[PDB]
Design a protein around this ligand. Sequence first.
Ligand SMILES: O=P(O)(O)O[C@H]1[C@H](OP(=O)(O)O)[C@@H](OP(=O)(O)O)[C@H](OP(=O)(O)O)[C@@H](OP(=O)(O)O)[C@H]1OP(=O)(O)O
Ligand SMILES: O=P(O)(O)O[C@H]1[C@H](OP(=O)(O)O)[C@@H](OP(=O)(O)O)[C@H](OP(=O)(O)O)[C@@H](OP(=O)(O)O)[C@H]1OP(=O)(O)O
Ligand SMILES: [K+]
Ligand SMILES: [K+]
Ligand SMILES: [K+]
Ligand SMILES: [K+]
Ligand SMILES: [Zn+2]
Ligand SMILES: [Zn+2]
Lengths: 64, 369, 369, 274, 274
Amino acid sequence: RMDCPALPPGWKKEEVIRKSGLSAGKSDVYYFSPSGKKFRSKPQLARYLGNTVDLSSFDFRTGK
Amino acid sequence: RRKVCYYYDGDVGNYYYGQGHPMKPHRIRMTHNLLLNYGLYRKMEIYRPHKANAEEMTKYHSDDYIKFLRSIRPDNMSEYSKQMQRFNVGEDCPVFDGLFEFCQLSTGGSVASAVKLNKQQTDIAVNWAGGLHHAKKSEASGFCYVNDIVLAILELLKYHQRVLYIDIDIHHGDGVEEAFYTTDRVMTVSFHKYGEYFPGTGDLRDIGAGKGKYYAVNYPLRDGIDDESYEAIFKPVMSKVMEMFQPSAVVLQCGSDSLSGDRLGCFNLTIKGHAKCVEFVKSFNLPMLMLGGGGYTIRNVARCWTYETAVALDTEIPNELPYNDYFEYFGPDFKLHISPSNMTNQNTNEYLEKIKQRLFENLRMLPHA
Amino acid sequence: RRKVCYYYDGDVGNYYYGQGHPMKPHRIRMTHNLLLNYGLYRKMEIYRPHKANAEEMTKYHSDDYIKFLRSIRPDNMSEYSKQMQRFNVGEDCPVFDGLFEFCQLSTGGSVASAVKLNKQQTDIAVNWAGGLHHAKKSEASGFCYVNDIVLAILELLKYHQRVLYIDIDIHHGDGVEEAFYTTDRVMTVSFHKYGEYFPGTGDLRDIGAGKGKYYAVNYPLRDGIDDESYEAIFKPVMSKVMEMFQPSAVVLQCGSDSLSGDRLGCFNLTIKGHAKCVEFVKSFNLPMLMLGGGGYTIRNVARCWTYETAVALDTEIPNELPYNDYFEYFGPDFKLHISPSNMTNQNTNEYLEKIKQRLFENLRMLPHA
Amino acid sequence: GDYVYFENSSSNPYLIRRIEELNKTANGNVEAKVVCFYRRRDISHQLRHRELFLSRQLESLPATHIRGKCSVTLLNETESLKSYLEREDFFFYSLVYDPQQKTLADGEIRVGNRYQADITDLLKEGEEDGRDQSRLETQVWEAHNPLTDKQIDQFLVVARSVGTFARALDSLHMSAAAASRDITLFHAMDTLHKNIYDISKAISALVPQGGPVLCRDEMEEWSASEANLFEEALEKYGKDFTDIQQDFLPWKSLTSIIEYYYMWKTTDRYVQQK
Amino acid sequence: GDYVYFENSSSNPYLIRRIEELNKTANGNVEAKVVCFYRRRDISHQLRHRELFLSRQLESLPATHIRGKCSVTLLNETESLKSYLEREDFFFYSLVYDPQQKTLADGEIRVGNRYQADITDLLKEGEEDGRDQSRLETQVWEAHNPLTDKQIDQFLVVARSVGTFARALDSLHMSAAAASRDITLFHAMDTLHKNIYDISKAISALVPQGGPVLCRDEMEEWSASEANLFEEALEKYGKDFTDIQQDFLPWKSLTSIIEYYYMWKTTDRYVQQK
Ligand SMILES: O=P(O)(O)O[C@H]1[C@H](OP(=O)(O)O)[C@@H](OP(=O)(O)O)[C@H](OP(=O)(O)O)[C@@H](OP(=O)(O)O)[C@H]1OP(=O)(O)O
Ligand SMILES: O=P(O)(O)O[C@H]1[C@H](OP(=O)(O)O)[C@@H](OP(=O)(O)O)[C@H](OP(=O)(O)O)[C@@H](OP(=O)(O)O)[C@H]1OP(=O)(O)O
Ligand SMILES: [K+]
Ligand SMILES: [K+]
Ligand SMILES: [K+]
Ligand SMILES: [K+]
Ligand SMILES: [Zn+2]
Ligand SMILES: [Zn+2]
């Protein structure tokens, strides 16, 4: 769980490698709120944050 | 044959913008390394640039913008977020470890070289790290944090009445433009894509203001421009520019995202065509300061600036890439040159001649005899 | 500190006397190689000796003895057998491929060096290949085909009135003795085993003849002589010799079969003792020409002449043998020095003093003031 | 091939169409087959007032629907139209629009003290810039050397040989390649310059006290197990190099991990491509 | 302990003996136990007239056999005897002779024109020896060089490194050791001297055109199969190197086979000792 400096304080990003199946070796990216709530996509994260951040130019995968 | 000074700090390839980010400083290290193995390194004066301190960065920028940069880290990233938004540091300009170190090297290279040019102890000076032209006085923009170009130019003005700034980068050089928008001592010429593209500025009607009116030249362009079309509109315009603006020092930003198959760019230029511009400029035998800039298919960025360095030394190099630490990066081919794509050039002759003429009028407004 | 000239031809180690034969030229190559790795090579003037031609070998030998040698091969070995018997080439002096080449190198080294001494452009000159002292005018003997020593001495007589010849080899130096038996210009001193031993000559009563009477000194010895006994009888006699014979050039044959544990020899000398003689001679500061000679436990032959070369350069070397191509030859120890054996010294003080006195009388017969 | 103004049944501006075929039936009624020109709104500003898009929508309607004839020009011909010849009848097209899919061929500059730079005044012929050049640069290779290409080349071979012999003293081809990498070469070009381009002096530098020198880049320098760690951290965290350190290689400095990364991307055993 | 002259029954000179024990029997008859002194003939010239050897032969004979007493002195005491005191009675010994075994403590020089050398006359102060020194020698190392031990040492390391890098271009430790053998070093000391002890010039010699130089002794140079041939020829013909060539390695020159032999005797895989 890495701090994501471009999100507000306490937000973290984690990348997880798939271990088996059709997409073995590909990864999934997750974000965690300061309380530890887990988010799995850009629109889910944007819905949660609302107007407190502008995510138009935010690259969900890299966190930049 | 002109004397060339090359500025490089080994650390510059190792600073990293962030996962998924297109700007990759490593491309300068790739160039550096080719230059050594193409035997060009040998042939020019190689300088390590000391770090530029806040002292000389504030010669243009805010005392509290640089202060912010000197201070900010990924540690205190959630503490500063207030100031982060006021200064544009985020979505496409990340914070990252070493950021301020990176700026110091890019700026040090350009400034040191400017001095070198003023001190009249070189003809050409090259700093591929530099060229970061979207930066503003009080905010970062388009991957640029410090505008090394402005600072460089500001030093040159100490010995040069008129400084010409040429910008090949596919993106409009609005940082260098805005910084000198109201002065007649510096003329900013820029050839770039326009229309649903960054930075949204630099159309035909962007001419300057005040004393700086008729001193900001722009050439807006659509997708798919050839070497042939580009050459046929660069030489005419620049010869007029020299004719009219009569400068005593040139600063050529050699942005490599105007090449074909760039990740962000959508022009169809080859290294050959791209370089023909550097060669044409060099021909006007003025103190010259080559900087880099954009470029996001780094294999080609490497190729380009390696080639364009040869051009400053007017030495030939083979298409055969020499072995190097990153040799394996260069496709199945391992060649220096790239060829243009089947991509369609939407810059019809009619559209280029309309613009050309409008610019020729603008340039005629300057004083002459 | 004296200047030393060292003569060596790489080929000399590679000539071979024959299966089961004790004389092994390879021991010179072993020395050569140690000298390089002990750093001594560095410190002296190194010369390759050109081949001595029949021209200068016949300056002492028969025009038809050398002719025979130039001609003989293992091919025409059954054709010549007539002449083979007249010239002693067989049982313990084999014919072998390159034989005449071997002689030319051994003789070239000694002659070149003699010249070098006469030309007064060295103080010491060293040729380990040389020293082959059993050869006669018209026949080979005791592994010696050409008597390089005589030829060497003959050149020295061109500039030196009196030439002293000292012979440490365990075998009596009858070749050099017989060649100069009737002259007063060259004095031949020799310390050797006697009694059921080769060459059967050189007892107490072997004094010379004619003008050469009282000019051939000999010291006959039994088995097992120490460094201590040898030193105590060499220095006294040689100081008298210098005192009386007052020479102007010395030629020291440094036969290494007088060392302990030799294959053919039966003396109990150490490298240290053996060398003490070379050092004592050198001390008399005369143009000096060190040659080798016998030696048949080649590991020690190598050691000896390596050490004795150091002595001519009066530089120290460690007992630790330096690595070299033949490093593995030198036992489990890999040391330079050897120690004496439990072997019993049958040279009682009474027997050595009897002889000593007889020689002191002989030497007194020379002219002096 | 002519362009026409059809009835707009809502009262609104006329619909524009290109005539593909003009047909008359047996009862003398005239009908026309027509390709639609779409208005920018209807295509469901850089769009001019008179923009029209050539669609793939084809319709057939009676000739009574035609109220007028028009010109839909190329973009160049519209822009060339003179002010007097400007009319209600003139329109233009530059885009083909697929009506079914929606498919289509394929920001301000500021003035003020807080935007422009203060322009640095030209120095007097007596005034001096006051800039300490040692605080700005330190030279690493002079281009005008008493040496020739051959000699430099030769020295580079020597610098490589030492390096191989160095790593022989604690795989032959491997060590030679290792010693032939750029770091060793760069170090060879500095050794020259530091020693004032004296070959004989520079070679001492390479063998200081009879002992050779080793230059190893992060690629070669890392342990087997560090290399291993890296391939686990990458395959698990992708290219997130701060977390790759924090969790996998925390004893290494970020910037060494970067340098390693790029060098590792050329690895032989590395095959992400097919 | 006295020495006596016994009857010689043949008429010849008296036999000499040392008295070990004098015995008288019950009937007053006197017998003596005596160690024999052997005459030089009987010991079956450096032997003097009066040499006698102390034997391990012991006999017993009656006292009537004694005809006289004598002195058998040490060698030193015999030689010290004065001319007047010289007698028939004085003899000497210096050797113990085993009579049973035959054991005993533990060739001509010629004169004439065909033996002696003609002595070369001393040259006049005006006369010159007339000897061309280039026909006699060619120098291979000057001992007074502008170079220091360190620099020569250093050069030797470099000469070794090139060599290793040379054989890397068509086992690391093996190639380095190979390049560290004497042949390479000797070649390094000549390269110096040929180039007038100019380090910078000499290094070019080692890398003529960017390419290094290889020196391989017969040990390293022979093929695997030649090496093999040699170990068959030796184990079969012993150290008979002309036949070893004729029958096993006839394409090699005898003198290369010799040089190889000696180098091979130090081989590791070579263990004739235990
Ligand atoms: O290592 P990074 O700096 O993140 O860049 C890599 C790299 O691009 P470069 O080689 O031009 O640096 C990959 O190229 P290869 O390693 O495959 O040669 C590329 O993969 P593709 O060239 O196949 O696109 C990949 O892109 P992606 O992440 O989309 O796979 C991209 O990473 P970024 O996209 O994060 O820059
Ligand atoms: O190779 P060669 O010139 O014929 O000499 C060898 C050699 O003696 P050196 O090493 O002194 O030259 C042997 O020694 P190693 O190879 O065993 O070390 C020795 O064997 P010993 O030392 O065990 O006697 C052997 O002697 P031999 O043939 O009696 O076994 C002897 O050969 P030559 O006797 O023919 O000289
Ligand atoms: K531009
Ligand atoms: K301007
Ligand atoms: K002797
Ligand atoms: K004599
Ligand atoms: Zn750009
Ligand atoms: Zn001998």
